[PDB]
């Protein structure tokens, strides 16, 4: 599990706005997980199954850590980021505080870099916990693996900082909860139907493309 | 290149020394809790099996609340806060006494000496399978990691100061006294197996896979309202169930952590 690789995977990246960024990084997503070590390796089901599971969670991720610098916002994929104010109106500001208050200024005031990000990104991809995986203590190992050059690197790049390790593990609990809120806030506009949603995030939303994008 | 203080060994001692003397009074109450009961044809061997549970499980509350009160810096905090964590942290505790008490020899989860119980018997008491079965699947979880009384009080201790609960008011004092705990947990794993590394990272894990169980015991509390059945106050108020005590006005927790 070596860290520039899963780095370089993070490098490799260059209202109904939210919705429309989220189906759009689904693609990307994709890309992200087979150049990290060991994932194209494993079998093509759990591979789906570990993308279903972690999509929510790694997105919102990549969107907390693209944020670090812009104040009371996200900065989406797409370009363009959604303000404090604007979120509050549409219905959805109390998760929208969570991610800047538990993510954003956490990832900020730690400076947490493109390799550590990545390695977590990874630890939330390898969830031996996904249902239905044919082999959970294959992706158990590779999780764990992530564990041990996560902590390496750390020890190394920030020597003189001796629970960095776990300041970083410690934001996947607030992260999985988070997640959990911001999916059943998605499943609410997908039931409303207010504004049509992208045929990959409406695949990713309702339980082929990504069958499709997998080889 | 680690150590395990004098300050953090004793510091450890303290959590394990005040979770033994809180099963004492949480064994003391073992005659309150309605007998586990053939069915008659009136239905109410299903009302006692619940009621089993019900009355457990505030046996269960009870003890977490008197165990944070011996968590050293927990009474420092202010009484909104410690509401606000005992809310949010009740149902992961809760999951977490239950997989320590459980057999893998006979596949049962033993409460209070006396009462053992079976994927069944979960059943029985009312429980639905899609809660039961990620119950047995942590639980079993648990045991492959296999730990110890200071590894299980000090993951609680943890698990307590989790700033990013609802209702938060000081996420800061929070989260500087986590901190200590999460340093005592590293040290003492270390020091434990010197060899496994892995261990501390695969414990602060568990905690995420708690925040699922949370989401899952919600899906629980959604179909026992669909099932017309009734969790006495304490419980409603903590898990936001019935129209009145879910409001907090009934201000229990509150009442229970002043004495
Ligand atoms: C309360 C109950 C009707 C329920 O609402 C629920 O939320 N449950 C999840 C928690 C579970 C408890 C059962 C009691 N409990 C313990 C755990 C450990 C002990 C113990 O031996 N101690 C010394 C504390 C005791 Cl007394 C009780 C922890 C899990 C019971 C089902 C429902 F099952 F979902 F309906």
């Known amino acids: 599990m070596p860290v520039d690789r899963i780095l370089e995977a993070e490098l490799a990246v260059e209202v109904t706005n939210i919705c429309q960024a989220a189906d759009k990084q689904l693609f990307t997503l994709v890309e992200w997980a087979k150049r990290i070590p060991h994932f194209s390796s494993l079998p093509l089901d759990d591979q789906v199954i570990l993308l279903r599971a972690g999509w929510n969670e790694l997105l919102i991720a990549s969107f907390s850590h693209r944020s670090i610098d812009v104040r009371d916002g996200i900065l989406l994929a797409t370009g363009l980021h959604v303000h404090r104010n604007s979120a509050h109106s549409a219905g959805v500001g109390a998760i929208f505080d969570r991610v800047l208050t538990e993510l954003v200024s956490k990832m900020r005031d730690m400076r947490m870099d493109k390799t550590e990000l990545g390695c977590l990104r990874a630890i939330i991809l390898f969830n031996p916990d996904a249902k239905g995986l044919s082999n959970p203590s294959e992706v158990e190992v590779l999780r764990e693996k992530v564990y041990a050059s996560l902590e390496t690197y750390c020890k190394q790049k920030y020597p003189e900082q001796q629970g960095r390790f776990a300041k970083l593990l410690l934001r996947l609990p607030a992260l999985r909860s988070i997640g959990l809120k911001c999916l059943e806030h998605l499943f609410f506009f997908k039931l409303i139907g207010d504004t049509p949603i992208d045929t990959f995030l409406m695949e990713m939303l309702e339980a082929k493309i990504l069958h499709r994008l997998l080889q | 290149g680690v150590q395990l203080t004098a300050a953090q060994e004793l510091m450890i001692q303290q959590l394990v020394a005040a979770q033994l003397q809180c099963n004492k009074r949480s064994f003391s109450d073992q005659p309150k809790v309605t ?225």
């Open chain 2, 35 to 259: 007998p586990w009961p053939a069915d008659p044809a009136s239905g109410s061997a299903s009302q006692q099996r619940f009621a089993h549970f019900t009355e457990l499980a505030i046996i269960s509350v009870q003890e977490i609340v008197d165990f944070a009160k011996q968590v050293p810096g927990f009474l420092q905090l202010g009484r909104e806060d410690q509401i606000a964590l005992l809310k949010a942290s009740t149902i992961e505790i809760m999951l977490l006494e239950t997989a320590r008490r459980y057999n893998h020899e006979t596949e049962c989860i033993t409460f209070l000496k006396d009462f053992t119980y079976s994927k069944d018997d979960f059943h029985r008491a009312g429980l639905q399978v899609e809660f039961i079965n990620p119950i047995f699947e942590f639980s079993r979880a648990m045991r492959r990691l296999g730990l110890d009384d200071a590894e299980y009080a000090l993951l609680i201790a943890i698990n307590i100061f989790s700033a990013d609960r609802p209702n938060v008011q000081e996420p800061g004092r929070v989260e500087a006294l986590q901190q200590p705990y999460v340093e005592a947990l590293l040290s003492y794993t270390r020091i434990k197996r010197p060899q496994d590394q892995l261990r501390f990272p695969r414990m602060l894990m568990k905690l995420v896979s708690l925040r699922t169980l949370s989401s899952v015991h919600s899906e629980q509390v959604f179909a026992l309202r669909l099932q017309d059945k009734k969790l006495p106050p304490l419980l409603s108020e903590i898990w936001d169930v019935h129209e009145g005590s879910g409001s907090g006005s009934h201000k229990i927790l509150h009442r229970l952590l002043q004495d």
